[PDB]
Design a protein around this ligand. Sequence first.
Ligand SMILES: CNC(=O)[C@H](C)N1Cc2ccc(Cl)cc2[C@H](C(=O)Nc2cncc3ccccc23)C1
Ligand SMILES: CNC(=O)[C@H](C)N1Cc2ccc(Cl)cc2[C@H](C(=O)Nc2cncc3ccccc23)C1
Ligand SMILES: [Cl-]
Lengths: 301, 297
Amino acid sequence: SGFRKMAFPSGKVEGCMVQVTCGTTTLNGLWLDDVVYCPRHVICTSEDMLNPNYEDLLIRKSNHNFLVQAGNVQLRVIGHSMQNCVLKLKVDTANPKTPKYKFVRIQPGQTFSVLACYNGSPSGVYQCAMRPNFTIKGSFLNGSCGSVGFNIDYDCVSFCYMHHMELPTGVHAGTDLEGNFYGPFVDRQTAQAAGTDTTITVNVLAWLYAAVINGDRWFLNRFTTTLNDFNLVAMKYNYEPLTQDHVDILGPLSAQTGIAVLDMCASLKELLQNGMNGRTILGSALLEDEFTPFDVVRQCS
Amino acid sequence: SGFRKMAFPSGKVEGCMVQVTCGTTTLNGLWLDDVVYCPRHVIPNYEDLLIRKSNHNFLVQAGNVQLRVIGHSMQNCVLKLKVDTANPKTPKYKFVRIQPGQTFSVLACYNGSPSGVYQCAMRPNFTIKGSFLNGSCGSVGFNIDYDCVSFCYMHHMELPTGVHAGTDLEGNFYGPFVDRQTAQAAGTDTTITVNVLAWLYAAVINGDRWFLNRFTTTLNDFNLVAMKYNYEPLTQDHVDILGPLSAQTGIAVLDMCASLKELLQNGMNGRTILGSALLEDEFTPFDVVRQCSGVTF
Ligand SMILES: CNC(=O)[C@H](C)N1Cc2ccc(Cl)cc2[C@H](C(=O)Nc2cncc3ccccc23)C1
Ligand SMILES: CNC(=O)[C@H](C)N1Cc2ccc(Cl)cc2[C@H](C(=O)Nc2cncc3ccccc23)C1
Ligand SMILES: [Cl-]
């Protein structure tokens, strides 16, 4: 029993964190096999950030301009290349602590663990979700760039995020491990803003099923809804549309609890209308949207 | 910017988790130096049950390797299995007993394999609101101080309300609980006042100031009000501990207490603080300073 926001154990990722320095800029890098991955903006000055020509800035650098530190050991950079917004530094030592890994690009609504780092040293681990507007609500200070997001389903680490910047609203923007940004963002200090955010509907439904599994049914009702009528109501509360894919994905939880997906959709419509009336669901007075259907099945009985 | 419930990096603890089997029971053990620590319920008159066991009855598995048990002893509610091999991954460590209101990270494990890490607090009623299923017994709670792991909790059981009970690493239970199947219940819980105040300071640091007011209060008047809402009493020690946060934000501790008093009597009025519609009490003053300064391990 119990339901917590739970992160994956971070040990396999801690053994990959290194410090990357280029001139006056210091940030974090991810050391896997004989390559260190880090944000390309490590080659920029604060001035270069408005309209940087990364190709022009990189061609002026040599291997010995990049200082890479793994614990108390200095690694030797023997090559460098840029792939999208990520810099790949070839080093002369393969990481003996390299776990089994994959690079995965995730979709909005997916969750992952973040190992927040400063100066190549891990400081904390937290769980978060890729928002529908492609930002993440992280907890990051200056020097956290290069910190990574990951999932460890089974024994393999799937790297899905690398931190690059903080937008003016305090939310964060980054890339996959191939350097492609999530969202319409660029690694430039030009005027950029997160779009209006919405609630991840399929995740709220998954979390209502987690509450039923743990014993709570106060929010259920005798009603059902069509998918179209639910979406017409949901859109008015800034909730993401629920697709047939989402309904199919909630199938196993529906079968376990005996509550059809459209019946749970009717319960969500009522909660949006009534609020909680002084009650809580799994210790929360708000509807939680940072647990996926897969997270609920993994954590719950 | 941002404020998350954050756990310590778990790597130093993952390298200590092993599986302990005795008969039909399988649970988790903590392998430090040449000793494996686990709940004594893996084997009631525990001395009479233990005397009937031999070293070979305890099967200890570290990854895919079987460890050899060469001795066994009991210390309070913890079983200590002496093994032939010292853990090469043993970090610098201490065993510490924590107080209610203090927070720690839990590395939830099943079959000696870590599955998740979460942050939690020792409630004033000595239970923890964890997330545990069958097989989780032996999972540990910890904090990190520079490079030293301070082990403070070992999981033993789940109470009928879904909350959890356990011991320090010396086998002494937190709370009036016993390791046996008998009627036990968590006592009435209270809110950790000093932690709610620390969390209000974190919200201010992050630009959430709607709840601030021009008012102040005496410590006595605040405690009279706090006692009415099932909040723990705030002591002068707590006020002193919130000193640095008070100096950084410019809001005196008793000034923040007047905000807390208005929040208890009037509510949030449809608003949120750090994305929460409830007053959060599982961040200590030290947690707030650490997360709003980026201390590394
Ligand atoms: C808020 N940002 C800033 O004040 C400065 C000037 N930033 C500009 C900028 C523009 C583009 C890119 Cl790709 C990176 C960056 C940097 C950036 O975003 N770094 C940070 C990341 N995460 C969290 C932070 C928290 C505080 C301060 C920097 C944080 C610097
Ligand atoms: C809820 N408990 C049970 O069903 C059984 C009969 N328990 C009795 C008992 C009595 C004393 C001690 Cl010290 C331990 C234990 C066991 C216990 O509590 N283990 C569990 C721990 N955490 C989480 C759990 C979740 C589910 C089921 C067991 C969980 C088993
Ligand atoms: Cl995905």
